[PDB]
Amino acid sequence: GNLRVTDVTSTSVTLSWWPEIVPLHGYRVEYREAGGEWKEVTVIDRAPEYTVTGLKPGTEYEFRVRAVSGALYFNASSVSVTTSNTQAERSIIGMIDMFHKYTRRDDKIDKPSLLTMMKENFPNFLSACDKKGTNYLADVFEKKDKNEDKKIDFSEFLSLLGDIATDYHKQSHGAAPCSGGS
Amino acid sequence: NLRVTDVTSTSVTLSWWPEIVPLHGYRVEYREAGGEWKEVTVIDRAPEYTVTGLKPGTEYEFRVRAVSGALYFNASSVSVTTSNTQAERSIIGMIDMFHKYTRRDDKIDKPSLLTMMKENFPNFLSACDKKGTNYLADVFEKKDKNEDKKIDFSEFLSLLGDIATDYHKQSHGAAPCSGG
């Protein structure tokens, strides 16, 4: 969520995430000079700030980020430093990036990570489900893991969004949250 | 999340957002403190609307709902005297963006549907022109699975499934507007 520079020195750039109140369980930070060669560095557990160093004073530096699931973030990213996307489009790109904040190398999410994402991304909806006396996290994985691989690929994750999206449209028409006797 | 670009002692000019284009049939609602929910339908994409004949120096509330009877924001409101996660919000705005184009039946017609895409997914469509693949050519007839000449919400999502699946592939390197 908005990849931003928070301090710049003559050979050290600092970057922030501000993701799900927490980053992605791993994030590559690629960087090159203006017409440079991409240098990578893999940060780990939920570190929301990373500072690059060793750079050249008064030099143009490009940056971009990837996921454990070998894939880029922020659309295609690319910021620059010297030492027209519509709301709906951006709303799309973020959701992919949300997937890619929990997926491991395979680009799929395990039950541990899924229940995390839920809690950090859809908290008021989960709370809602409690208030009525529904435990969504019980049978979410088994429901949306139709293929029973014990892994949520994008496809399976979309079907989830689809179920939440539904609720919100229901809620829009005025349906008390977490409706689904099913 | 409705802007208030002016207030006088007896008037309130409300305003929409950023894109020179609002809904196409909004219904506005407002009341005193403890007040009575007065309404005023507004057919037309009238981007600003000035409510009039108000009590001076009074705490009013204002809200919106849609031609698709009932909705807008998170059923939020604004107040004047004369929250959610990015994910939870990113949904709500997509519901709003839905209802922004539906008719009083909560369903999107084909010309309505083009406008939605041209207004909310221009750069996506531009990419398909780079290649030269008219994305709008078949989309409705395609997505309108029930052949009711009407896109409904479950069909809208599907479409979004098709938009977001590509943006997925892109993130993993694939050309924009790949296919299948």
UniProtKB/Swiss-Prot annotation, chain B:
Localization per Swiss-Prot or TrEMBL: Cytoplasm; Secreted
Superkingdom, natural source: Eukaryota
Domain EF-hand, chain residue ranges per copy: 94-129, 131-166
Entries under SUPFAM superfamilies matching the protein: EF-hand
A Gene Ontology BP annotation from the UniProt entry: epidermis development
Main location: cytoplasm
GO CC annotation, single: nucleus
Residues bearing PTM N-acetylserine: 83
Subunit organization: Interacts with RANBP9.
Protein name as annotated: Protein S100-A7
Species this chain originates from: Homo sapiens
